[PDB]
């Protein structure tokens, strides 16, 4: 009974970062070999856990969060970072225990003339708490005058499209990101490695 990591890593469509997807991995056997062998990921960074020993560990639960961002922004998917993504879209906690995996997806998520499906939150009054997901689309009020749901001066739509084009520099090309969070609590461990 193997964990459905393929549904996450090999999904055909990915979510926007502001509406990042969370898959709950439980009651299964986790084989993390796909992370070591391939060298098909451009980012593989673990915190609070040893990367090479993942197959020896059991956990209460696993979370697989998935989204798409710019290459320039993959550095923000880590504990203690700041910027538009970490502040307004996807925030890891300082004591994060898990791994961040990312790979370039320019051939899949970029379209000629701009792909407008992937968005990021551009305006927000305060930062996100760790693992907070804000899907609001209310007009952002930048001044004292209320917006009443119409765009205009001091009244911005809070989301902006990445508009991924294949001509983009590597830093502005789309990257697919999966964050594995490892939860160890005083409960039965339902996700163990092989054997």
């Amino acid at each position, epitope marked *: 009974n193997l964990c459905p990591f393929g549904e996450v890593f090999n999904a055909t469509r990915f979510a926007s970062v502001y509406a990042w997807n969370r898959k709950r991995i439980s009651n299964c056997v986790a084989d993390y070999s796909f992370l070591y062998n391939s060298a098909s990921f451009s980012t593989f960074k673990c915190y609070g856990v040893s990367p090479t020993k993942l197959n020896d560990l059991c956990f209460t639960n696993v979370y697989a969060d998935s989204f798409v961002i710019r290459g320039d922004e993959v550095r923000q998917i880590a504990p203690g970072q700041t910027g538009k993504i970490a502040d307004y879209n996807y925030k890891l906690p300082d004591d994060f225990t898990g791994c961040v995996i990312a790979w370039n997806s320019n051939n899949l998520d970029s379209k000629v003339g701009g792909n407008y499906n992937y968005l990021y939150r551009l305006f927000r009054k305060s930062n996100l708490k760790p693992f907070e997901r804000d899907i609001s689309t209310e007009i952002y009020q930048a001044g004292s005058t209320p917006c009443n749901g119409v765009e205009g001066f001091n009244c911005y739509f809070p989301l902006q499209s990445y508009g991924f084009q294949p001509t*983009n520099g590597v830093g502005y090309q789309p990257y697919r990101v999966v964050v594995l969070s490892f939860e160890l609590l005083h409960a039965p461990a339902t996700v163990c490695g092989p054997k």
Partner: antibody
Amino acid sequence: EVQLVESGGGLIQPGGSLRLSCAASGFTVSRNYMSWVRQAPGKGLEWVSVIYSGGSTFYADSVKGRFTISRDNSKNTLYLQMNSLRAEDTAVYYCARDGDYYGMDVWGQGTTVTVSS
Amino acid sequence: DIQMTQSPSFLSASVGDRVTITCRASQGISSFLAWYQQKPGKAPKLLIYGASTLQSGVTSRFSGSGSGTEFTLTISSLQPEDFATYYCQRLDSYPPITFGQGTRLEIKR
């Protein structure tokens, strides 16, 4: 009225410190990206610093570690504290309400900083 | 870093002319580009954002086009208040933030 009013520029020796102020009207400072951009004599525009509505701050490499951007919400005012000033910091300094994809739409009138021994 | 190069450095034209100035990004940046105007001794004025969206209040004679690496600002009917310096900017409020070095539009004789 929508405006940014700057002050605090002046003449100072290298190694000195200077605080620039930027009072806003027509929008709320704490709810916007706010940037400092400078222009040396006869040169182009150089972005200096930015502060997010959520509080994150960022700096250009040329001033990182020496300048500090901040804000006072009670006065709706942006500040730039400049330490360890150098001759090449000499410039007209502008504040602006930044909008990322929306560009910088509201600019202050600029205040002049001269660093010389 | 992605460089932003404006061309040419100085451009001469007459009142009534149709004028184009170019900004080149060293790498593709989709439509994350702004155009500003600046007269001597005054602060910049936002003309275009999103490569083609005209800032409100700016005259329709200004038009921005291009996407990726080549961007153009076009002034369809030059009026005397248009003689100034014009800057481009990559649109991304995160370091590094880069402006073009500027194009000065001057009176032809």
